Amino acid sequence: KTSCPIKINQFEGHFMKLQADSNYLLSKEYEELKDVGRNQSCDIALLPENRGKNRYNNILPYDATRVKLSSDYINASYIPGNNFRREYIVTQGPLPGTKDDFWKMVWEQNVHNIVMVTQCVEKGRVKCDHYWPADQDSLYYGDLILQMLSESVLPEWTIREFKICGEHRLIRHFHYTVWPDHGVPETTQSLIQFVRTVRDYINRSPGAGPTVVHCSAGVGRTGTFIALDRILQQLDSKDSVDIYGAVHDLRLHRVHMVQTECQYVYLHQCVRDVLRAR
Numbered sequence: 001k002t003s004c005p006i007k008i009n010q011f012e013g014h015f016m017k018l019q020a021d022s023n024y025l026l027s028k029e030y031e032e033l034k035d036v037g038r039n040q041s042c043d044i045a046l047l048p049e050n051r052g053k054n055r056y057n058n059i060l061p062y063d064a065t066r067v068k069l070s071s072d073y074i075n076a077s078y079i080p081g082n083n084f085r086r087e088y089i090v091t092q093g094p095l096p097g098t099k100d101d102f103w104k105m106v107w108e109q110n111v112h113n114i115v116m117v118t119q120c121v122e123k124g125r126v127k128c129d130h131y132w133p134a135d136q137d138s139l140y141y142g143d144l145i146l147q148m149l150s151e152s153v154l155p156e157w158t159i160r161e162f163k164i165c166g167e168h169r170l171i172r173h174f175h176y177t178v179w180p181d182h183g184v185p186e187t188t189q190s191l192i193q194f195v196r197t198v199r200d201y202i203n204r205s206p207g208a209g210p211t212v213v214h215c216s217a218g219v220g221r222t223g224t225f226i227a228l229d230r231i232l233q234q235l236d237s238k239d240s241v242d243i244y245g246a247v248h249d250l251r252l253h254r255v256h257m258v259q260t261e262c263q264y265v266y267l268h269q270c271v272r273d274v275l276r277a278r
């Protein structure tokens with residue numbers, strides 16, 4: 001199994017079924033995805049030299065799908081989307097000691113858009129280094145110089161633009177700030193409108209490499225972001241929605257994508273609201 005495609009007109013009822021008896025069928029479903037991708041090794045991320053480069057010792061990219069730096073090690077994975085095979089690069093939240101590698105990756109891979117769906121610290125627990133500059137002052141990261149051009153705060157996300165000088169790119173950073181680790185946003189609408197805003201900018205980024213998405217580990221809130229990005233496009237696009245198949249494809253690429261069942265529920269809730277409203 002692989003893809004479970006649902007007719008738009010059937011989605012609501014189907015979601016109800018999954019929801020019946022304390023989420024019984026949904027629990028069964030989320031559970032079929034448990035073993036997807038589990039055949040794959042992570043030997044490179046385990047090399048001694050790379051140990052300090054992983055934020056979590058049990059969240060490591062598959063060798064088969066990892067992003068290589070042109071010492072080639074970053075904790076990052078290529079991920080297919082609705083449209084192409086290297087549609088996203090998914091990564092952990094940079095560490096103080098990996099932020100130069102992360103920006104080196106952004107530069108080499110031609111990325112114009114970065115989506116961050118973690119806070120750097122939540123309730124005191126560290127999640128992600130503050131790997132861009134505090135303000136308008138420029139900073140080096142390895143052999144790159146970065147300047148923050150602009151920073152617009154909104155209630156639920158902040159959009160920054162960076163200028164990178166390498167060996168003249170404008171990078172847009174999309175920071176959603178109210179997504180609790182291991183949890184889900186307080187509403188469907190907030191993330192639905194964030195994704196739609198991000199997709200709009202990605203749509204307008206002619207020539208861009210992969211979109212970067214990260215959270216803390218780069219699995220749960222990252223994977224939910226991307227599964228949502230994928231499915232909202234199917235909804236505009238198609239007579240079907242494939243949530244199971246989105247999450248399945250993600251898992252073939254990186255461990256634990258969509259990391260709690262409640263994130264999997266929340267995906268179904270978002271489709272349902274978009275479909276109720278239309």
Ligand SMILES: COC(=O)C(Cc1ccccc1)(Cc1ccc(NS(=O)(=O)O)cc1)C(=O)OC
Nearest residue numbers: 056057181182215216217218219220221222259
């Ligand atoms: C050593 O680290 C772990 O075991 C963690 C988080 C954790 C949990 C309990 C105690 C310590 C760390 C790693 C982890 C996994 C998912 C997230 N959420 S995400 O940032 O949205 O992907 C954060 C952190 C985990 O859940 O692995 C499956």
